[PDB]
Amino acid sequence: SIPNSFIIVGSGVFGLSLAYALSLDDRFADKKIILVDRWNFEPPNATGSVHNPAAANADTSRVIRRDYPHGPYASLALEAMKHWRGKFGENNRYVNQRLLFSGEGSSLTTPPKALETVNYIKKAYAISCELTPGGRDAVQVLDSLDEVRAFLGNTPSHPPHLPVNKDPAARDLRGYVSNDCGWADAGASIEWLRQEVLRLGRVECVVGEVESLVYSDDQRAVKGVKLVDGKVLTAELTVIAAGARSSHILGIPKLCDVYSEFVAYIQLTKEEADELRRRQWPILVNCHRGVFAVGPDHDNCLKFGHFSYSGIVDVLREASIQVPTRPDGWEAQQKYWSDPRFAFGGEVKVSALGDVDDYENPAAQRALADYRLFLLELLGPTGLQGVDTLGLDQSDNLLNNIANRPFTRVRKCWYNDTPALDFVVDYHPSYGKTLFVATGGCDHAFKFLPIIGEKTLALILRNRGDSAVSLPAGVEPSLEELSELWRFPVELLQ
Amino acid sequence: SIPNSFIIVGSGVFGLSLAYALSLDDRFADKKIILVDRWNFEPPNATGSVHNPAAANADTSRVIRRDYPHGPYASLALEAMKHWRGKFGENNRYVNQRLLFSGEGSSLTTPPKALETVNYIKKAYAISCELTPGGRDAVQVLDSLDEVRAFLGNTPSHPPHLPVNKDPAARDLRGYVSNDCGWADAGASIEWLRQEVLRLGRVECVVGEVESLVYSDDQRAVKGVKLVDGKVLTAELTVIAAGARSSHILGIPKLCDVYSEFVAYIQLTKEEADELRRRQWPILVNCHRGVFAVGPDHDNCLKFGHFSYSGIVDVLREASIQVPTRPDGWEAQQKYWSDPRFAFGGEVKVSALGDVDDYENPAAQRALADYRLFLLELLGPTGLQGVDTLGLDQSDNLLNNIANRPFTRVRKCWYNDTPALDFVVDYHPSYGKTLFVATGGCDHAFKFLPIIGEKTLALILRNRGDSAVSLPAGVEPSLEELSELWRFPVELLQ
Ligand SMILES: Cc1cc2nc3c(=O)[nH]c(=O)nc-3n(C[C@H](O)[C@H](O)[C@H](O)COP(=O)(O)OP(=O)(O)OC[C@H]3O[C@@H](n4cnc5c(N)ncnc54)[C@H](O)[C@@H]3O)c2cc1C
């Protein structure tokens, strides 16, 4: 029943993980598998593989955490964590790092009240106590901004003359610590996984850019793909895993909401990065500002990322705040498809005066402002306070210099959001079982790199009519559960 | 009775203004006057004069405002304003610019309540209504941060779901506008005044650094000054007007509190500076953050200065907040005198990563943080608010880019504070009437450049025993009043 030939479009998280899974399944050793990508991962006179700097996985760090709410994504990334702690994370591809999870509102133990961004943490805190051995007694909690600042070796921001508010219903930064978190060098991870796939020798890799799907004369099936250079590749099954370009290739402007975000890096000195690492510097997440910081990484940099648009929706929802649908979203992406710069990420130009020099400069201004406020509130000498906060006797000058340091580099990365934030790993219903879609990674798919190819492979086999494939032993989510969660959205077809 | 020979040490605000006054008084055309300064204002193959980049007057802008509280400094700078609007401000040396005066607390018309930094404004607002024609009806008032932001062509920072607080006793940024304010190009001003003094031909100018005073064998009088190069200059009267170095030259570690401050400049494009000027961009003073902004200036830059240490004392006092005496202040300056970098200002080095590279790097961190917070609160897309402030449909992208732009240059400037913030323009009582001190400019002396030399000259003549000198007509402050206000502090002598 299984397919006899494959074309995988996209050597990213979904596609390259699929190629790897099929390379381990001996039932396909004789079958022809083609993995085509725009980017040449093995250019001439290069040692090993180089990752695609325009892909959404191109980053020296990606955050892997798994205290997400109970569900299928709950059990999926703890399974992935076993690989990040094993062979996938060897040679420093994975790093462990405590994570400080924070927001603004009333005390963390106090029940959720409306209109407080802490409610996103209170949900993550209540669940963290359930999974972590020891329960709520083994989970450290910081219940004020000045506790978070002290936690990093900084001074209090609160003015001296004003008295500390004992009321636990007043507004302040609230936060908890989780130790079973870390980050992976996403680039080096892809490069290693790529070298692995090449060694197993079961997969043919092709440099080329897919321009159209190809159908038969009846248009009841997909034969393969047509490249921009003329070549036409044919196989029994064609898998679209092109990241942010998938809606374009598939011709479905509503399948994903595609939009870019800017990411900032501050370079540290060897001495500074050592100082923070000795302080056990954590990954810092502040959902009230929409900013998180990771590092110091393998380049001795602190990376500052932003909550995506869909991500801020969830935070504000948990606080009983509706936000409108994203401007210029969903089908509006189609007028951009002709631009080769759309869905194309990587380094961003900087002007003489230090501005972002990019055709999407205005989109960058909000992220950069949030990053600087996040920095000053935590690492600056007075938090966000004015002159009534005295104490110029009291400061950590190393943290202050970081908080005033201009961003050293800026990069651009593209999201690929779905309505329910669920992946789409299913068959296009119009063409029987000849065209498979594996995309919609939103803003959280990289962590599942080691296991997503396997789950994707079982979905390819099951929904062909064969129910023999069931997933091993008692691993949850179930294969039947996953086929539901990543069903092809048919609303768009009719 | 008048002196027969002069030595003026310091071609700055006090000294150069004195030389100019004596150059207009015909009673001294035959008398020998010497103005010695470390810096050569007329170097070879240079056209005209160049200002001393290490002096405390070396800046492309200095703020001239005169709605200071009622008193002698009240009537003194309105007199000076007539010259800034006349010959002293010709050839663009003076610029007019509205001024937005602001702080944090309850509504501006509401009476002062304790612990609110607005109280400094409420005093300045209540007095502004007294001098300005029309009274309180002719004075524009902005009573919320979102009114100040709207006043500059920016969006509201307040979140949409939260409702506007109608209570006028809640905390917010409050501010008023004064139109009779501006700024002078301090450097070009000194250079012109210098060329004026040279043309009148009555004053001899000497390049050299004073190392010690010289006394007679009885030490009941001062003969002159000894230079580092050996030269000894003699005159009947020696005038110490060496700015921040005066305590050193005089050997009185307690006479002034000497400390540096860092100043920041963001460069604008021609189009941006034009846009703000078309918007009637004001000088912005926020005493809650201790920051003010001036420009765009003649280089198309925005300059960000900080309230001095003594200046923040006054703001917090008006709010019923005592602050301790400055660390490392007053007599502690003496261990620095041997360093040629002490009391020496000008451009500051920037590291590879963009840090301030200066032996006083830690002192800079507070000012730079305050500057960025001031910028973001007023010009950033969300003020200081987080993600609950939506409205990414709504932004002024030009203001946002400025608020994210790294500081282009940083300079250092030294203050020269007194206990009561009053100048010291009097005779050293120990040496009869042979040694005169004209220093202690604190942080507000530059504006008085056109008239301070005249007032200084009358004080030189009066306190010699001759009461004939009285100051013309009915100009206040009185000469007797000024001799009191700038009396030599004898507490230090006994
Ligand atoms: C700033 C940012 C931060 C993120 N943070 C996190 C995080 O902390 N943790 C986390 O787990 N995830 C995170 N994500 C999400 C994660 O990086 C993505 O979900 C993941 O990269 C999805 O990969 P993909 O396979 O869908 O596409 P990608 O990884 O982008 O790869 C797609 C590949 O398909 C190729 N392709 C595209 N079009 C064509 C064509 N026409 N022909 C041939 N080839 C083509 C591309 O060249 C590319 O190589 C983040 C994403 C961004 C942008």
Ligand SMILES: Cc1cc2nc3c(=O)[nH]c(=O)nc-3n(C[C@H](O)[C@H](O)[C@H](O)COP(=O)(O)OP(=O)(O)OC[C@H]3O[C@@H](n4cnc5c(N)ncnc54)[C@H](O)[C@@H]3O)c2cc1C
């Ligand atoms: C950052 C900053 C912002 C300010 N803001 C304002 C403002 O907005 N408005 C305002 O009105 N004022 C302001 N002030 C204050 C004003 O600039 C000063 O009060 C003014 O410069 C005082 O001048 P002075 O004559 O005392 O000394 P200076 O103007 O510094 O000149 C002193 C001169 O004496 C010379 N000298 C020193 N030692 C010796 C020696 N041993 N031998 C020979 N010569 C010597 C120096 O070389 C120098 O040329 C500010 C000051 C600073 C630093």
